[PDB]
Structure formats: C-alpha cells, structure tokens
Design a protein around this ligand. Structure first.
Ligand SMILES: [Mg+2]
Ligand SMILES: [Mg+2]
Ligand SMILES: [Mg+2]
Ligand SMILES: [Mg+2]
Ligand SMILES: [Mg+2]
Ligand SMILES: [Mg+2]
Ligand SMILES: [Mg+2]
Ligand SMILES: [Mg+2]
Ligand SMILES: [Mg+2]
Ligand SMILES: [Mg+2]
Ligand SMILES: [Mg+2]
Ligand SMILES: [Mg+2]
Ligand SMILES: [Mg+2]
Ligand SMILES: [Mg+2]
Ligand SMILES: [Mg+2]
Ligand SMILES: [Mg+2]
Ligand SMILES: [Mg+2]
Ligand SMILES: [Mg+2]
Ligand SMILES: [Mg+2]
Ligand SMILES: [Mg+2]
Ligand SMILES: [Mg+2]
Ligand SMILES: [Mg+2]
Ligand SMILES: [Mg+2]
Ligand SMILES: [Mg+2]
Ligand SMILES: [Mg+2]
Ligand SMILES: [Mg+2]
Ligand SMILES: [Mg+2]
Ligand SMILES: [Mg+2]
Ligand SMILES: [Mg+2]
Ligand SMILES: [Mg+2]
Ligand SMILES: [Mg+2]
Ligand SMILES: [Mg+2]
Ligand SMILES: [Mg+2]
Ligand SMILES: [Mg+2]
Ligand SMILES: [Mg+2]
Ligand SMILES: [Mg+2]
Ligand SMILES: [Mg+2]
Ligand SMILES: [Mg+2]
Ligand SMILES: [Mg+2]
Ligand SMILES: [Mg+2]
Ligand SMILES: [Mg+2]
Ligand SMILES: [Mg+2]
Ligand SMILES: [Mg+2]
Ligand SMILES: [Mg+2]
Ligand SMILES: [Mg+2]
Ligand SMILES: [Mg+2]
Ligand SMILES: [Mg+2]
Ligand SMILES: [Mg+2]
Ligand SMILES: [Mg+2]
Ligand SMILES: [Mg+2]
Ligand SMILES: [Mg+2]
Ligand SMILES: [Mg+2]
Ligand SMILES: [Mg+2]
Ligand SMILES: [Mg+2]
Ligand SMILES: [Mg+2]
Ligand SMILES: [Mg+2]
Ligand SMILES: [Mg+2]
Ligand SMILES: [Mg+2]
Ligand SMILES: [Mg+2]
Ligand SMILES: [Mg+2]
Ligand SMILES: [Mg+2]
Lengths: 84, 59
RNA sequence: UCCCCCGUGCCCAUAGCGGCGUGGAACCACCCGUUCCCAUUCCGAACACGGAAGUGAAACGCGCCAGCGCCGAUGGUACUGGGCGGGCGACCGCCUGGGAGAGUAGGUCGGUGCGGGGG
RNA sequence: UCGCCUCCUAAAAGGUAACGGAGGCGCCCAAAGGUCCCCUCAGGCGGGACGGAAAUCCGCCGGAGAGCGCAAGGGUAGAAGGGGGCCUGACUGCGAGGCCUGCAAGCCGAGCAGGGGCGAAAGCCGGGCCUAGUGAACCGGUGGUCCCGUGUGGAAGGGCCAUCGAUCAACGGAUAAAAGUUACCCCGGGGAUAACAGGCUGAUCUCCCCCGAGCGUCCACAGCGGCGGGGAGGUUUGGCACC
RNA sequence: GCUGACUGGGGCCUGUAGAGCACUGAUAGGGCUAGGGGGCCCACCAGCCUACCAAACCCUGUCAAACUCCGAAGGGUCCCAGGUGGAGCCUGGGAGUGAGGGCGCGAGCGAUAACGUCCGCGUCCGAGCGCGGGAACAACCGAGACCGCCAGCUAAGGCCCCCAAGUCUGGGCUAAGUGGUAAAGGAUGUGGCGCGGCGAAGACAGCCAGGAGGUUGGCUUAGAAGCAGCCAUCCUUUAAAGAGUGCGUAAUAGCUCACUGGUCGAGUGGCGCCGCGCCGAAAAUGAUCGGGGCUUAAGCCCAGCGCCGAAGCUGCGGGUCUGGGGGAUGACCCCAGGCGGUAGGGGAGCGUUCCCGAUGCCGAUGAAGGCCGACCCGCGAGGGCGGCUGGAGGUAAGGGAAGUG
RNA sequence: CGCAAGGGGUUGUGGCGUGCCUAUUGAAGCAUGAGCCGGCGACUCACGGUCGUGGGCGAGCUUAAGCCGUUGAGGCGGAGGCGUAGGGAAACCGAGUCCGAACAGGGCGCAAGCGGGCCGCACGCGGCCCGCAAAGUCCGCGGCCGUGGACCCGAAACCGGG
C-alpha cells in the first residue's frame, strides 16, 4: 500500500458562462424590443433605430428588418431598417 | 430535365446521421435499390454528400 | 454647365505622416483692440466681443515626390468539409471540394454627393 | 474543496468535464450619481532652481500603449477619462417586446401617466463603462395602510404596502437546538471500491546497445565510458481498478 | 397539416487550424550604445581603451492554451427552394433512464504509459453475444435476421490441401522462411535511379622502380628527428616525392602511403537516392504463419480476366402493420411501403376457479382426471377427434367476477 | 407401420454449434441461484384523486343515512355534493376584476355555435331535433396517483407485559 501524502491545488474555480454574442443577424425580421446583440463593451455600436442598455445591450425599437454595417475605424453597427 | 438515377450500393450502417438522413431525403431505403430523381441543385446536394454509398448515372 | 474658395456629409490610409510648390483679388485665417455680452484653476493663449492699419509668416487650401506608413497580385505552399489508407507509436499519405499567412512583382501622396460666394 | 466574478482549457455560434492551468468577490461612492459647458493622455527627445531615472514647467514628436476605486477580460479620447455650475431620475404608477433558462431566479428595456433635474434648444436622467460585492421560504420587529376583527361597539391579534434580523459561506438554505469511540462489535449491500494474487502499463527496477569527454606510461574501445541517446525484460516499488 | 432531418442559393455573425510578431511576454547572436568591474590616466572640466557585466534601440533568426497586424476549412442563424417521413408541431395519458463501454478524431490529466481518466463530434455494443469476414473474439471490415425454398447475383474476405472458388494471365522484387510483426545504430546483401571524376595522348587493381636535398621546420626540463599545440603557413634538384598516410622506436633506425616512371593494356573508383532483405533481437509447461505445407511462390509490389462467398440483393410462395383505394362496405380483393430488439408503452388473444345461461343440456352405449397419438384447426397460448385407463360427475353459444398460468 | 406415396424408432459418418436465470459497460464463463420431480409461492382491495372510456340526463346531474317491499324484487328518501362567474389578502365589485390618481398600461377573467334531417308548411325557419356540446354530472370499465403492510420474502435492532 503506497499513498504518500498527496499534494493539493486551489485554482480550480471558474465563472458562469454568460451566453453573450449576436442574437439576431441581418435579414432577420424583429419586433420592437428584440435584443439583437448582447455584448459586454461596445463591440457593436447602436445604429439607426437601435437602443443601448446599461450593458451596451443593443435592442431594436422599430418593427422591421435587421442589418449591420462596417464603418472601419468607426466601429461596426446594427440598424433595423423599418418594414416600409 | 435530366433525371438522375442514383443507386444505393454501400450500407449506411456506421456513417454519421446526416449521411443516413441524406439517403432518406433522396428516397433511398434498402440496398441496391435505385431511384430516378429530377436533376436539380438541391438533389445533387445530397447525392454528392452520400455519393460514397450510391452510384450515379444520368438519364 | 466649367475652374477657385467657404461651409457639409459619405467612403474610412491606395483617403496620412513627413519633405518641396504655391495661393489671398475674393472668401478664411493671423491680426488691431478687449469699453461693452462673455471669459481663464492664471493668461482675451482658449472661449468672446468691436473692429479693420498690415499679412499669408503661422494655420489652412491646392499641387509635387516615394522614404516611412499603407494597399497588395499571380503563382506555390500550410491548413482543412467530405472520402479512402499507412505506422508499434510520435505521426504520416492518396482522392475530391475550399484555401490562407507571410514573401515577391506592383499599386498609392485620394474619390465623391448637397448647398453657398466668386471668374 | 463547497456560493459568486475574469481568462484559458472549449475543437472561430451557444454550451461543455477533471483534486486541469492563473487570479479576484462577500465591498465601495452623496459624489465615484443626473445634466450642461469646457478640457485630452502615456511615454520618447530637448531645455530645465532644489530637481531620483517620473514632482510641477516650456518646446516639439506621440492615436492611444495613459486613465477609468479594486481581479481579469471586453470596451473607450468623435470619452466611459480630466475640470467647473446647478441639481437628486440612487423617482412613483406601469411596462410592448425580448436575452437566459428544467423549476425560480438573472438580464435588456422602448413607450404612457404623475411630479421633478439640468440645457437656449434638440434632448438626456428609472444610479455608477460593463461583467463579482450575494441568500428562497418560514418566524418575528418597526413604520404606514383602515381591509378582517368571533352577539354589538372598541380593543387584542392578523392582513396589505414599506423595511429590518442569515460566514442559513456545506452559500437551492435538514432541527430553534448536536461531538467522539468500538480490536466487544452487529445487519444490509459492493468485486459499483481498497489490501492478496492475476491482468493492462512499464515511470521506477534489472539487463544490453549507440556516441566517444576522458582514463589507461605511450594509446578512445585490454579493461573502462563524462555529458547525453535507443531498447529489451516484467522478478521491485508503484499507476490503473478489468474477473 | 409540409412546417422535419438532409440539401441548393443568398446575407452576416466567429477567431480554431495555419501563420505572424504590430500588442503582452519569451528568445540566440550581432550592431550601436545609459550605466557599472575596470583600463592610459592630463585630474574635475571633460577624458581614451576594454575577445568581461550590460540597458533601451535597430538587424538577423525564432517561441505562446490564458499573445494576435492576420486568418481558412468549417460551423451557427434567418430568408427563399427541394424534401409525404413510424418527418415535424400542439394538448393530454403511461413510462423507463439518470453505473455506460469500445473505436476514430479534437484537447486536458498522466509519463502524448495504461483494456487509464475527463470533456467535444461520430459510430457501433448496450438492446444486433442474430448472420459473413477477421483462426478463435460485445463494439475492426461486411451487413440491419417477418416465415419458407435441394434456385440466382453479390459484400468484406478469399480462390494449394484442411476449406467453397484460379496450383489464373502478363512485368517486376525477395533468398530470409523475410513473409509469420520492435528502435537508435551498424554493414562490398541484393535490384534500380542519379549526379559528378577519372580512363585506349593507357586509367582501376596487382606487380617493378623512385619516394630525395632544404633539416632533426621552429616550439617543449626531460627528446618530440614527417607522426603532442602554433605562427610563416612556404622553398630545392625534379618524372615525382610531404615541413608528411598509417605501423613503429624512449628518441633516432626501420616498414609504408601520399605523387609518377614503367610494365598490363579495358573500364574503373566517389558519393546521393529507392525497393526488399542481414544484424541489432534474452524469460520462464510443448511447439507452430490457425495447421499441413509454400521459394519464377501458396511471400511482397503493379496491371487484367473470372469465379467463391451473408440471414445483404433478386426470383417464387406465404403471414402481418400502416396508408391509399375497391367502395355494390364483399372487413374480401389488387396497389405501395414497412415488419432485429433490452428498460418500457400500446393492441389483440389462449387457458384456470367460480356465477347467470340451468326445473336446461351432456353422462354407466361411461363424467372429471390420467396414459398415448405419425390425424384435424390455430401464427402462438390452445381447441379438436381417436385408442386405453377411470367409475360419477360435467356443463355451449353469450356474457359476468377473480385467491387465475 | 401401410397396397402405395409416405410415416415412426435408432444412429454410422459429414457440416454447424460457448447451458438457464440473475446481475452487468461486458458472462460458456473460473461472477449469483438451482440435486431432480410434484404441490404452495409475489402488483390486490377500500376510500379519495386524475386522465381515458361505455352509457343515462343534461341548465342540470345525483342522493346518503334511513323508511316501506322482497327473502337472490325493488321502490321511496333532496339533508347533502358537484356544476351554472371570475377577480381581490380582504371589505367588496361583477363580465368584469386586481395594482394604480389614471377611461395609461398590464395580470387573471368572457365573449359556443351547429354538421344539420324534418317540418308549422308567415317566400319566414320557428324550433323540434341533433352530437353530445354551450357543459356538466351520474353510474360502469380501464390506466396512473394519494392514504393504508400496498408487488412478495429478508434484517442488525426499538418498546410493552411476562
Ligand atoms: Mg440606459
Ligand atoms: Mg462498417
Ligand atoms: Mg465557444
Ligand atoms: Mg465549435
Ligand atoms: Mg457634475
Ligand atoms: Mg422566466
Ligand atoms: Mg366584537
Ligand atoms: Mg546512459
Ligand atoms: Mg508480472
Ligand atoms: Mg472506470
Ligand atoms: Mg419548405
Ligand atoms: Mg428548418
Ligand atoms: Mg444553406
Ligand atoms: Mg491562437
Ligand atoms: Mg498554432
Ligand atoms: Mg449559410
Ligand atoms: Mg420518432
Ligand atoms: Mg407524452
Ligand atoms: Mg452519471
Ligand atoms: Mg463509470
Ligand atoms: Mg460516473
Ligand atoms: Mg454514448
Ligand atoms: Mg461519458
Ligand atoms: Mg462514445
Ligand atoms: Mg489518452
Ligand atoms: Mg475506459
Ligand atoms: Mg486509451
Ligand atoms: Mg464523471
Ligand atoms: Mg444499435
Ligand atoms: Mg456483432
Ligand atoms: Mg459470445
Ligand atoms: Mg463476427
Ligand atoms: Mg469469425
Ligand atoms: Mg428488417
Ligand atoms: Mg458468382
Ligand atoms: Mg471484391
Ligand atoms: Mg476447393
Ligand atoms: Mg528488423
Ligand atoms: Mg533502421
Ligand atoms: Mg510473377
Ligand atoms: Mg432480406
Ligand atoms: Mg407485405
Ligand atoms: Mg418487433
Ligand atoms: Mg344451474
Ligand atoms: Mg354399460
Ligand atoms: Mg370442476
Ligand atoms: Mg397468486
Ligand atoms: Mg450482482
Ligand atoms: Mg444494461
Ligand atoms: Mg463451470
Ligand atoms: Mg456459474
Ligand atoms: Mg453479488
Ligand atoms: Mg439467480
Ligand atoms: Mg452451489
Ligand atoms: Mg420444482
Ligand atoms: Mg413444481
Ligand atoms: Mg377509485
Ligand atoms: Mg379511476
Ligand atoms: Mg383588465
Ligand atoms: Mg416482507
Ligand atoms: Mg420488563
């Protein structure tokens, strides 16, 4: 029988997964309120017809379609062009 | 159009689900059996995905 | 319609940085003042006001260059959906689609709408 | 070690385990909040009274490497950073529509109404750049409510609204209330699980081989073999937990 | 009631593979250069040099799960299309399961050990210990077993005998029984590509002759004469002979080979690859690739024709589950698919005890039970009928209860 | 055996073949249980509940105890229970109601006819009728759930009186 004293650790704790990311991709029809993106920082700037919540939480406020737009060094966006 | 004649010749037992599903989409069930389908992109889709189990010829 | 300038947006470096031109007739700026509205952690520097002698020096606008920046092929790899094999193993190979990153040839000192003043 | 947060492992959606790898939380701020108006950093090189190699200055050069209360990440000067003025929306009544999710919880929130804050105005304000700073129920306390109140009236006592007492941290929380010992031991079970032997493995062990520093008076290989390298065996000590 | 899996075409969402240092860190050398040993030192006013230490910075080379200037394949999702499937969606009734395992691939742990361990996708086993191949063998290759056939084609794997089918046909390789399973590392093993160098103005080997003078080159405690470490790194008479290739002396001596004369008078040495083989290779009851045996193969590699070979697929007959139809509702007919299965769900039936049916009906010309049957019906549980035994009970259709197998 | 075709008994060779149950990732397993045979041997019943189902009646349905009758004859009995209004913590209001100051909002709520033969025989469908509903109830049957020993067998032990 050999079980010499067994060492120990500690750094064995992690955090809960937050399921962040883009929740609605361009072309998708969305009602007002539908929280499109749900990032942490400003990865995606609020576009026309879009609203930013406490946590930069992007959400549409107009019943229409979705669509992004890369402005280069101006940061990406995500406006919901109205179903006109 | 140019209906394609696909014939299942290799057993699907041991292949991913999508592969067996492809066969189901083409209408193939038993072995050897050969069906004739319309030659359209959507049909070619599966036939090419499960081509390693079904021999194809044009008609 | 066409050049120049003044404001404005879009494209977000092939749209800049830095050298070298040049421009004031007009607009613009620098200036002359700062009693007055208004100001500075303290300075009319900056905001702000009233001006009009002088100027393009600065700043800005418009050209010129490739040196930095940037852009960047074509080929050929890497890697890999899917399919089929080899090695005791570490790993590796063929078929069929997809296909970089670097590197090289080379490209660039912008393009462009709306409204104004002026030839 | 046990709940929560950040990064990785996680295989470019989301999720994803191990006594895997590496760090944090159990607060705090009345200004570190709301709004309006201004301001822009760190360093590099110069030149600088005491001045370290950063005190504060001045001049270029510098798109962000500074800063943002604290971990880490994301974000960010076209401000979330730095300063100044009034302020209290760190609202009340709600809440379309969603994110996340077994359950209930967590989260984002336009918009309407009441009464306000700042701004000329457009407008923005339902705490804080963001993601940790937390605790169901039950039992009670304190304000209000006027809802019920045992024949009637009033009381006692409840309810409703608000709020309080948890290292219930074993952090979904058994009781308001809790340690040991048994070789004097007992039952139900397990080869789901240790000790023996076997099995698989071969780090460790035993063995031989490759290289030839360098020893051997001279000379690498009579006899040896530094640093290192490739193997075999399964008799050691173990690993695994397969009958 | 077409929305499913799967697929085609669009649109983005992303940071793995890979790669790359622009960020964060790690990096070897070099340059340049703050310092600091310290150095010539004219001595404070700097200074100069440095095969040491050494910032920052540049150049050349790289490294990363918690780095990213960059970045696939793919993957996710939405829209439009295919897609009638024991697809989907909604509501409700019944569950069982919450010990999984092997294989492949992507990670961790481990020691990139384990029939190890923990996740990810997939797939099989589980429940396909049903069938073929793999000698035997849950999970490797083949393939999803409704029943029957003394028919047929195939799969993997095979075709010399065991053992069904080629001692098949062309071109090669191997000589070990490699084949029939181990490494670094060795080696004039074989066979095939290369690419250079020498050679009929005579190479290669062997043999014959020379292989010298500078001098023992300078340098070492012993000495170091071609043979322990360097500078210069060369000369001489020459066909050609080194300041020397080994052997060897304590050191000289000696024997040699570098080179060329000469005979001889046709090829000959160098290295780089590729195939297959040799050694490297020792463990415990008796040996062997499954066995016998196999050598222009019965091994290995490459073409080809053809057969064998499953419960797969056809052919023939039958049963059953769904759906669609016939619909003369004929519950019987053709058409179309399906029918492995553990935990489980669902649906049909058989038999046992008893009650109504029974004041009935069977029964001594024999009840119930028992013992036989090669017959009849049914998919099956069974139900018949017949012979023997037995000797007094038994109980239809149609229903009802439950101490019911 | 039988006329026959065919059939019954035995088994010499050949081919193929890893007991049954249980428990498991995995068993012929050198894991459990069983010597063999016969007989006994384990998912029931009561009352509730929830679905489903065969009926009756349905803006309703239905009785309990008990009484009268039978002596394997059924009647009576509306106490009572469900159902016909949802909300609120409640007072309370009511197709509304609760939070709210609010005709803002929002949470529970409601908004049920007819496929349709016939026929009085208004150029009108009344309304009889209909599925079984609006829509429920009652009884039967079945599945599962609750309380009971609740599928059957098994402890080591605890307590009472002797
Ligand atoms: Mg907000
Ligand atoms: Mg297979
Ligand atoms: Mg992910
Ligand atoms: Mg992924
Ligand atoms: Mg303020
Ligand atoms: Mg919820
Ligand atoms: Mg009273
Ligand atoms: Mg060694
Ligand atoms: Mg052993
Ligand atoms: Mg295990
Ligand atoms: Mg469709
Ligand atoms: Mg779909
Ligand atoms: Mg698609
Ligand atoms: Mg990476
Ligand atoms: Mg990589
Ligand atoms: Mg797509
Ligand atoms: Mg299904
Ligand atoms: Mg269900
Ligand atoms: Mg588990
Ligand atoms: Mg397990
Ligand atoms: Mg487990
Ligand atoms: Mg599994
Ligand atoms: Mg698992
Ligand atoms: Mg698996
Ligand atoms: Mg492993
Ligand atoms: Mg395992
Ligand atoms: Mg393994
Ligand atoms: Mg586990
Ligand atoms: Mg299976
Ligand atoms: Mg099998
Ligand atoms: Mg077996
Ligand atoms: Mg098999
Ligand atoms: Mg076999
Ligand atoms: Mg089948
Ligand atoms: Mg054949
Ligand atoms: Mg074949
Ligand atoms: Mg034969
Ligand atoms: Mg060998
Ligand atoms: Mg070798
Ligand atoms: Mg041959
Ligand atoms: Mg078949
Ligand atoms: Mg059929
Ligand atoms: Mg079945
Ligand atoms: Mg009777
Ligand atoms: Mg008689
Ligand atoms: Mg009887
Ligand atoms: Mg019984
Ligand atoms: Mg057991
Ligand atoms: Mg099992
Ligand atoms: Mg036995
Ligand atoms: Mg046994
Ligand atoms: Mg047991
Ligand atoms: Mg048993
Ligand atoms: Mg026994
Ligand atoms: Mg018995
Ligand atoms: Mg018995
Ligand atoms: Mg009941
Ligand atoms: Mg019931
Ligand atoms: Mg309402
Ligand atoms: Mg019992
Ligand atoms: Mg007593």
């Amino acid at each position: 029988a050999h079980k010499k004293g067994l060492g120990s650790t500690r750094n064995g704790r992690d955090s809960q997964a937050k399921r962040l990311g883009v929740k609605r991709y361009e072309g998708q029809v969305v009602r007002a309120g539908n929280i499109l993106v749900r990032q942490r920082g400003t990865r995606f700037k609020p576009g026309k017809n879009v609203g930013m919540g406490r946590d930069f939480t992007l959400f549409a406020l107009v019943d229409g379609v979705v669509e992004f737009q890369d402005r280069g060094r101006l940061g990406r966006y995500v406006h919901v062009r109205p179903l006109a | 159009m140019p209906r394609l004649k696909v014939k299942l010749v290799k057993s699907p037992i041991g292949y991913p689900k999508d592969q067996k599903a492809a066969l189901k989409a083409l209408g193939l069930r038993r072995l050897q059996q050969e069906r004739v389908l319309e030659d359209t992109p959507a049909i070619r889709g599966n036939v090419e995905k499960v081509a390693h189990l079904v021999r194809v010829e044009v008609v």
